[PDB]
Structure formats: C-alpha cells, structure tokens
mmCIF file of C-alpha atoms in Angstrom:
data_model
loop_
_atom_site.group_PDB
_atom_site.id
_atom_site.type_symbol
_atom_site.label_atom_id
_atom_site.label_comp_id
_atom_site.label_asym_id
_atom_site.label_seq_id
_atom_site.Cartn_x
_atom_site.Cartn_y
_atom_site.Cartn_z
ATOM 1 C CA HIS A 2 23.030 14.130 -20.424
ATOM 2 C CA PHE A 3 22.430 12.777 -23.959
ATOM 3 C CA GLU A 4 21.487 16.354 -24.803
ATOM 4 C CA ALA A 5 25.177 17.075 -24.709
ATOM 5 C CA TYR A 6 25.556 14.952 -27.794
ATOM 6 C CA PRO A 7 24.859 16.150 -31.355
ATOM 7 C CA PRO A 8 22.006 14.314 -33.204
ATOM 8 C CA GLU A 9 24.563 12.640 -35.440
ATOM 9 C CA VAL A 10 25.749 10.574 -32.410
ATOM 10 C CA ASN A 11 22.390 9.976 -30.801
ATOM 11 C CA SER A 12 20.774 8.847 -33.980
ATOM 12 C CA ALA A 13 23.760 6.717 -35.078
ATOM 13 C CA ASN A 14 23.895 4.910 -31.667
ATOM 14 C CA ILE A 15 20.208 3.948 -31.558
ATOM 15 C CA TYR A 16 20.444 2.504 -35.137
ATOM 16 C CA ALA A 17 23.739 0.567 -34.707
ATOM 17 C CA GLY A 18 22.725 -2.391 -32.498
ATOM 18 C CA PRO A 19 21.682 -6.017 -33.058
ATOM 19 C CA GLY A 20 18.122 -5.240 -31.979
ATOM 20 C CA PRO A 21 15.873 -6.616 -29.185
ATOM 21 C CA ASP A 22 15.882 -10.328 -30.112
ATOM 22 C CA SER A 23 18.389 -11.084 -27.303
ATOM 23 C CA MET A 24 16.011 -9.414 -24.770
ATOM 24 C CA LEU A 25 12.910 -11.152 -26.106
ATOM 25 C CA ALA A 26 14.654 -14.549 -25.871
ATOM 26 C CA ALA A 27 15.465 -13.654 -22.250
ATOM 27 C CA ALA A 28 11.827 -12.778 -21.706
ATOM 28 C CA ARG A 29 10.630 -16.140 -23.049
ATOM 29 C CA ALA A 30 13.219 -17.797 -20.723
ATOM 30 C CA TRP A 31 11.985 -15.978 -17.610
ATOM 31 C CA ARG A 32 8.386 -17.000 -18.445
ATOM 32 C CA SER A 33 9.349 -20.733 -18.671
ATOM 33 C CA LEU A 34 11.351 -20.304 -15.477
ATOM 34 C CA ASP A 35 8.136 -18.907 -13.867
ATOM 35 C CA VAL A 36 6.137 -21.833 -15.102
ATOM 36 C CA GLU A 37 8.648 -24.484 -13.880
ATOM 37 C CA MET A 38 9.008 -22.948 -10.432
ATOM 38 C CA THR A 39 5.221 -22.699 -10.065
ATOM 39 C CA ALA A 40 5.059 -26.481 -10.673
ATOM 40 C CA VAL A 41 7.967 -26.887 -8.260
ATOM 41 C CA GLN A 42 5.907 -25.035 -5.685
ATOM 42 C CA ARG A 43 2.921 -27.258 -6.172
ATOM 43 C CA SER A 44 5.043 -30.414 -5.893
ATOM 44 C CA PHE A 45 6.548 -29.183 -2.648
ATOM 45 C CA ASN A 46 3.123 -28.554 -1.084
ATOM 46 C CA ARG A 47 1.826 -31.983 -2.317
ATOM 47 C CA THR A 48 4.820 -33.683 -0.767
ATOM 48 C CA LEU A 49 4.252 -32.000 2.666
ATOM 49 C CA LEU A 50 0.589 -33.006 2.563
ATOM 50 C CA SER A 51 1.398 -36.497 1.319
ATOM 51 C CA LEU A 52 3.800 -36.887 4.192
ATOM 52 C CA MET A 53 1.247 -35.629 6.762
ATOM 53 C CA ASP A 54 -1.725 -37.883 5.923
ATOM 54 C CA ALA A 55 0.530 -40.903 5.513
ATOM 55 C CA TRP A 56 2.323 -40.833 8.874
ATOM 56 C CA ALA A 57 0.974 -38.126 11.283
ATOM 57 C CA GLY A 58 3.331 -37.925 14.227
ATOM 58 C CA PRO A 59 5.070 -35.477 16.526
ATOM 59 C CA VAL A 60 8.223 -35.714 14.385
ATOM 60 C CA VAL A 61 6.381 -34.934 11.154
ATOM 61 C CA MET A 62 4.421 -32.045 12.540
ATOM 62 C CA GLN A 63 7.653 -30.531 13.737
ATOM 63 C CA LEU A 64 9.104 -30.687 10.194
ATOM 64 C CA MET A 65 5.850 -29.325 8.792
ATOM 65 C CA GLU A 66 6.174 -26.298 11.003
ATOM 66 C CA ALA A 67 9.855 -25.837 10.154
ATOM 67 C CA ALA A 68 9.020 -25.667 6.456
ATOM 68 C CA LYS A 69 6.302 -22.944 6.737
ATOM 69 C CA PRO A 70 8.786 -20.072 6.150
ATOM 70 C CA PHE A 71 10.145 -21.815 3.060
ATOM 71 C CA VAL A 72 6.799 -22.406 1.361
ATOM 72 C CA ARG A 73 6.089 -18.721 2.049
ATOM 73 C CA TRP A 74 9.377 -17.772 0.435
ATOM 74 C CA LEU A 75 8.595 -20.021 -2.552
ATOM 75 C CA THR A 76 5.343 -18.055 -3.081
ATOM 76 C CA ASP A 77 7.224 -14.790 -3.073
ATOM 77 C CA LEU A 78 9.781 -16.196 -5.468
ATOM 78 C CA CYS A 79 7.073 -17.313 -7.975
ATOM 79 C CA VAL A 80 5.384 -13.962 -7.806
ATOM 80 C CA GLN A 81 8.691 -12.264 -8.476
ATOM 81 C CA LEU A 82 9.439 -14.561 -11.409
ATOM 82 C CA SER A 83 6.195 -13.685 -13.219
ATOM 83 C CA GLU A 84 7.091 -10.032 -12.964
ATOM 84 C CA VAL A 85 10.328 -10.281 -15.053
ATOM 85 C CA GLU A 86 8.926 -10.886 -18.528
ATOM 86 C CA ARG A 87 6.595 -7.948 -18.231
ATOM 87 C CA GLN A 88 9.439 -5.542 -17.342
ATOM 88 C CA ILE A 89 11.646 -6.835 -20.123
ATOM 89 C CA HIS A 90 8.800 -6.202 -22.545
ATOM 90 C CA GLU A 91 8.551 -2.686 -21.209
ATOM 91 C CA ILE A 92 12.298 -2.161 -21.818
ATOM 92 C CA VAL A 93 12.025 -3.586 -25.314
ATOM 93 C CA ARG A 94 9.073 -1.326 -25.972
ATOM 94 C CA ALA A 95 11.024 1.667 -24.766
ATOM 95 C CA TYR A 96 13.867 0.826 -27.070
ATOM 96 C CA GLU A 97 11.523 0.333 -29.954
ATOM 97 C CA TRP A 98 10.001 3.808 -29.368
ATOM 98 C CA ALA A 99 13.432 5.406 -29.100
ATOM 99 C CA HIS A 100 14.451 3.740 -32.362
ATOM 100 C CA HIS A 101 11.315 4.876 -34.070
ATOM 101 C CA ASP A 102 11.314 8.533 -32.753
ATOM 102 C CA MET A 103 15.029 9.314 -33.302
ATOM 103 C CA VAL A 104 15.832 11.690 -36.147
ATOM 104 C CA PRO A 105 16.925 9.619 -39.183
ATOM 105 C CA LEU A 106 20.572 10.144 -40.209
ATOM 106 C CA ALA A 107 19.485 11.025 -43.782
ATOM 107 C CA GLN A 108 17.587 14.036 -42.586
ATOM 108 C CA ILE A 109 20.531 15.268 -40.461
ATOM 109 C CA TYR A 110 23.006 14.816 -43.252
ATOM 110 C CA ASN A 111 20.692 16.533 -45.812
ATOM 111 C CA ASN A 112 20.315 19.524 -43.482
ATOM 112 C CA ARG A 113 24.061 19.921 -43.088
ATOM 113 C CA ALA A 114 24.570 19.441 -46.783
ATOM 114 C CA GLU A 115 21.917 21.911 -47.771
ATOM 115 C CA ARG A 116 23.217 24.471 -45.283
ATOM 116 C CA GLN A 117 26.766 24.238 -46.671
ATOM 117 C CA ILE A 118 25.517 24.774 -50.245
ATOM 118 C CA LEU A 119 23.631 27.923 -49.292
ATOM 119 C CA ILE A 120 26.744 29.176 -47.405
ATOM 120 C CA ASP A 121 28.889 28.441 -50.492
ATOM 121 C CA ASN A 122 26.721 30.819 -52.496
ATOM 122 C CA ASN A 123 25.846 33.478 -49.968
ATOM 123 C CA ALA A 124 28.492 36.142 -50.811
ATOM 124 C CA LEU A 125 25.579 38.502 -51.652
ATOM 125 C CA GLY A 126 23.575 37.501 -48.537
ATOM 126 C CA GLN A 127 20.398 36.411 -50.287
ATOM 127 C CA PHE A 128 20.301 33.030 -48.514
ATOM 128 C CA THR A 129 20.836 34.257 -44.919
ATOM 129 C CA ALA A 130 17.197 33.738 -43.832
ATOM 130 C CA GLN A 131 17.172 30.199 -45.277
ATOM 131 C CA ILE A 132 20.518 29.309 -43.555
ATOM 132 C CA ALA A 133 18.928 30.544 -40.348
ATOM 133 C CA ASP A 134 16.026 28.245 -41.049
ATOM 134 C CA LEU A 135 18.403 25.293 -41.434
ATOM 135 C CA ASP A 136 20.336 26.070 -38.251
ATOM 136 C CA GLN A 137 17.016 26.160 -36.471
ATOM 137 C CA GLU A 138 15.984 22.799 -37.892
ATOM 138 C CA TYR A 139 19.406 21.266 -36.857
ATOM 139 C CA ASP A 140 18.900 22.722 -33.354
ATOM 140 C CA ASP A 141 15.474 21.119 -33.332
ATOM 141 C CA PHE A 142 17.064 17.757 -34.363
ATOM 142 C CA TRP A 143 19.547 18.154 -31.532
ATOM 143 C CA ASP A 144 16.842 18.824 -28.885
ATOM 144 C CA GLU A 145 14.532 16.096 -30.282
ATOM 145 C CA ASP A 146 17.245 13.371 -30.101
ATOM 146 C CA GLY A 147 17.979 14.637 -26.560
ATOM 147 C CA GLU A 148 14.302 14.380 -25.539
ATOM 148 C CA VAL A 149 13.915 10.895 -27.077
ATOM 149 C CA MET A 150 17.017 9.673 -25.244
ATOM 150 C CA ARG A 151 15.758 11.328 -22.014
ATOM 151 C CA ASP A 152 12.393 9.545 -22.209
ATOM 152 C CA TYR A 153 14.210 6.230 -23.061
ATOM 153 C CA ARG A 154 16.370 6.542 -19.942
ATOM 154 C CA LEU A 155 13.394 7.376 -17.779
ATOM 155 C CA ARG A 156 11.285 4.446 -19.055
ATOM 156 C CA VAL A 157 14.164 2.015 -18.649
ATOM 157 C CA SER A 158 14.968 3.220 -15.153
ATOM 158 C CA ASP A 159 11.251 2.900 -14.210
ATOM 159 C CA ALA A 160 11.114 -0.717 -15.571
ATOM 160 C CA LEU A 161 14.330 -1.711 -13.731
ATOM 161 C CA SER A 162 13.076 -0.300 -10.513
ATOM 162 C CA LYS A 163 10.205 -2.796 -10.518
ATOM 163 C CA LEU A 164 12.738 -5.689 -10.564
ATOM 164 C CA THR A 165 13.076 -6.369 -6.803
ATOM 165 C CA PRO A 166 16.381 -7.801 -5.614
ATOM 166 C CA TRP A 167 16.220 -11.528 -4.938
ATOM 167 C CA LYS A 168 15.982 -12.651 -1.335
ATOM 168 C CA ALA A 169 17.921 -15.619 0.078
ATOM 169 C CA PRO A 170 15.680 -18.565 1.169
ATOM 170 C CA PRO A 171 15.137 -19.279 4.879
ATOM 171 C CA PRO A 172 16.441 -22.608 6.217
ATOM 172 C CA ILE A 173 14.028 -25.480 6.903
ATOM 173 C CA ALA A 174 16.399 -27.267 9.299
ATOM 174 C CA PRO B 16 9.653 -44.074 8.966
ATOM 175 C CA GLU B 17 9.124 -45.292 5.407
ATOM 176 C CA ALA B 18 7.192 -42.147 4.635
ATOM 177 C CA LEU B 19 10.181 -39.986 5.625
ATOM 178 C CA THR B 20 12.496 -41.826 3.212
ATOM 179 C CA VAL B 21 9.842 -41.398 0.512
ATOM 180 C CA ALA B 22 9.529 -37.678 1.410
ATOM 181 C CA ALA B 23 13.290 -37.224 1.184
ATOM 182 C CA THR B 24 13.341 -38.680 -2.374
ATOM 183 C CA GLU B 25 10.396 -36.376 -3.504
ATOM 184 C CA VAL B 26 12.288 -33.349 -2.045
ATOM 185 C CA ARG B 27 15.435 -34.322 -3.909
ATOM 186 C CA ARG B 28 13.439 -34.669 -7.118
ATOM 187 C CA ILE B 29 12.090 -31.147 -6.522
ATOM 188 C CA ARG B 30 15.644 -29.918 -5.901
ATOM 189 C CA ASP B 31 16.827 -31.471 -9.209
ATOM 190 C CA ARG B 32 13.928 -29.975 -11.212
ATOM 191 C CA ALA B 33 14.628 -26.478 -9.731
ATOM 192 C CA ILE B 34 18.338 -26.794 -10.676
ATOM 193 C CA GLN B 35 17.619 -28.219 -14.068
ATOM 194 C CA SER B 36 15.135 -25.410 -15.055
ATOM 195 C CA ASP B 37 17.616 -22.806 -13.809
ATOM 196 C CA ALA B 38 20.464 -24.310 -15.847
ATOM 197 C CA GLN B 39 18.258 -24.803 -18.850
ATOM 198 C CA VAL B 40 17.511 -21.077 -19.470
ATOM 199 C CA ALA B 41 20.715 -19.578 -17.949
ATOM 200 C CA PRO B 42 22.309 -19.407 -21.432
ATOM 201 C CA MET B 43 19.403 -17.094 -22.475
ATOM 202 C CA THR B 44 18.897 -14.990 -19.341
ATOM 203 C CA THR B 45 22.614 -14.328 -18.716
ATOM 204 C CA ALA B 46 23.363 -13.477 -22.353
ATOM 205 C CA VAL B 47 21.191 -10.439 -22.863
ATOM 206 C CA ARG B 48 22.844 -8.021 -25.269
ATOM 207 C CA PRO B 49 22.251 -4.293 -25.614
ATOM 208 C CA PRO B 50 19.759 -3.742 -28.418
ATOM 209 C CA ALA B 51 21.620 -0.545 -29.505
ATOM 210 C CA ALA B 52 25.027 1.142 -29.006
ATOM 211 C CA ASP B 53 23.767 3.769 -26.635
ATOM 212 C CA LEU B 54 24.393 4.062 -22.908
ATOM 213 C CA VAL B 55 20.753 3.295 -21.926
ATOM 214 C CA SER B 56 20.634 0.034 -23.867
ATOM 215 C CA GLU B 57 23.894 -1.157 -22.340
ATOM 216 C CA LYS B 58 22.759 -0.376 -18.837
ATOM 217 C CA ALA B 59 19.528 -2.220 -19.339
ATOM 218 C CA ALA B 60 21.352 -5.266 -20.742
ATOM 219 C CA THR B 61 23.905 -5.189 -17.935
ATOM 220 C CA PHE B 62 21.223 -5.025 -15.289
ATOM 221 C CA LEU B 63 19.260 -7.955 -16.754
ATOM 222 C CA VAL B 64 22.363 -10.074 -16.866
ATOM 223 C CA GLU B 65 23.351 -9.272 -13.282
ATOM 224 C CA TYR B 66 19.705 -9.967 -12.193
ATOM 225 C CA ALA B 67 19.857 -13.404 -13.793
ATOM 226 C CA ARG B 68 23.165 -14.170 -12.109
ATOM 227 C CA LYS B 69 21.694 -13.142 -8.776
ATOM 228 C CA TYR B 70 18.676 -15.369 -9.412
ATOM 229 C CA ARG B 71 20.964 -18.368 -10.037
ATOM 230 C CA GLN B 72 22.657 -17.777 -6.661
ATOM 231 C CA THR B 73 19.260 -17.630 -5.072
ATOM 232 C CA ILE B 74 18.272 -20.982 -6.539
ATOM 233 C CA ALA B 75 21.505 -22.664 -5.589
ATOM 234 C CA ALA B 76 20.811 -21.480 -2.002
ATOM 235 C CA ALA B 77 17.322 -22.998 -2.329
ATOM 236 C CA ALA B 78 18.906 -26.229 -3.579
ATOM 237 C CA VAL B 79 21.061 -26.256 -0.401
ATOM 238 C CA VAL B 80 17.966 -25.708 1.808
ATOM 239 C CA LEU B 81 16.068 -28.530 0.071
ATOM 240 C CA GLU B 82 19.048 -30.953 0.382
ATOM 241 C CA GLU B 83 19.481 -30.140 4.064
ATOM 242 C CA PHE B 84 15.764 -30.787 4.514
ATOM 243 C CA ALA B 85 15.975 -34.090 2.721
ATOM 244 C CA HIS B 86 18.907 -35.054 4.895
ATOM 245 C CA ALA B 87 16.853 -34.265 7.981
ATOM 246 C CA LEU B 88 14.145 -36.424 6.525
ATOM 247 C CA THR B 89 16.696 -39.270 6.042
ATOM 248 C CA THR B 90 18.342 -38.754 9.412
ATOM 249 C CA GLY B 91 14.956 -38.491 11.112
ATOM 250 C CA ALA B 92 13.880 -41.799 9.592
ATOM 251 C CA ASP B 93 17.130 -43.602 10.764
ATOM 252 C CA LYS B 94 17.475 -41.858 14.098
ATOM 253 C CA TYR B 95 13.888 -42.440 15.158
ATOM 254 C CA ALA B 96 13.930 -46.113 14.325
ATOM 255 C CA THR B 97 16.823 -47.075 16.529
#
C-alpha cells in the first residue's frame, strides 16, 4: 500500500504532524475516567448493601435482584475502561517507532543530488557503477519506508482490535 | 420507606458523578489529533475519537437506567405507603 509511494512522500508525511501529545492527553483522560467509574461502581454497591441492611423487605429484595445485571455490566465497563490507556500507549509507541525508523529527508535528497551530479559528468561512462550504487540505495530507501509504514499499520490495527465496542447497559426497572 | 427515598438520592448522586466525569474529559478524548500526516495516524485518531463518542452514548444510556431506577425507588416508597 504505502510501498506505492516514493520515500520522499512517506518520510515527509511521518515528520509533518503535531506529534503524539494529543494522544497522550487522551490517554491520561481515559485513565481518570477509569478511576472515577471504579469509584462509581463501589458507591453503587455500597448503596445496594446500605439499602438492604436498613430495610430488608420483599420490595427491596426484588429491586436488589433487578439490579444484578447492571452491577455486572458496570464491572465489564470498568474493565474495558482500564484497557484504553494501554492501547493508546501502544499506538503512540508505534508512531514513535515509525518516526524514528523512517529514512530522513536529508539522506534521500543527498542521494538524488549526488546521482544527478554523477550523471551530469558521465559522458565518458566512468561513473556508471557508482550511479548504479546510488539507484540501489534509493530503491532501498523506498522499500525501507514501505516496510516501516507496513509495520506501523499492522501495530496500529492490532492495538485498535483490542478496543472492544461499548455495550449498552441493561435496564434495572 | 424512608430508606427508599434515601437510596433514590444516592443513586441520583451516582448518576451525576458518572455524567460529570464523562463531561469533564470529553474535550480530551474526543479531540485526538493524528500525530502525523500519514494515513495510519489519521485512521488511529479517527478511531479513538469515534470510540470516545460511543462511550459517551453508553454513559448517557447508563444515566437513563440509573434515573429510572431512582424513580422506581421513589415511586416504590410512595406507592407502598398508601
């Protein structure tokens, strides 16, 4: 896919953005969300218990039974919340690796520049082998950017696949 | 009877806290930007934003469930006292 792009494009694209601060901020947000909802979970169970021992009756036990699927759902929700920060960190890490491993624009430009210079002076054919060397290096740049972008896509797709779709809560009434 | 009215209030408090925490971090979770200009970064950002939006809808639904439950606690207290 990205192997159809020249390294000039693949390298430029990975260097252009604002960086991962936006994602890391989101990660800190999901963690706090996880903390808050865990406390919400505790408070919901303390309420049910506090209602049971205060006024134990047929009406209350019915309500206690009706809420059992919801406390179950709440547990699943909290588990799912604690998962998000970890997967965002995996995505950020993947990006950081892609950024680090991509062929720097300076190296690509210098290759193309050096190749043109040799070509400009190759009427006698003494630089043909070296020009071949530079074309090989550029082809390597091309394939390397392709591989880096391939691994990036794979790592991000893996991380996103661990983010289960949210399920709607069951009624208590 | 009194305990049911008390329970209804504690439930509503829980609903509020869930809604408040959701609203508090929504500007961060729904505003994820692509870290780079490439297609992979954009797809990751887009996913994380949509995921946050879907979570907010999930919490709003939970808020409804909690409020219905508090209403049943309130109706239960008044209905089973007359």
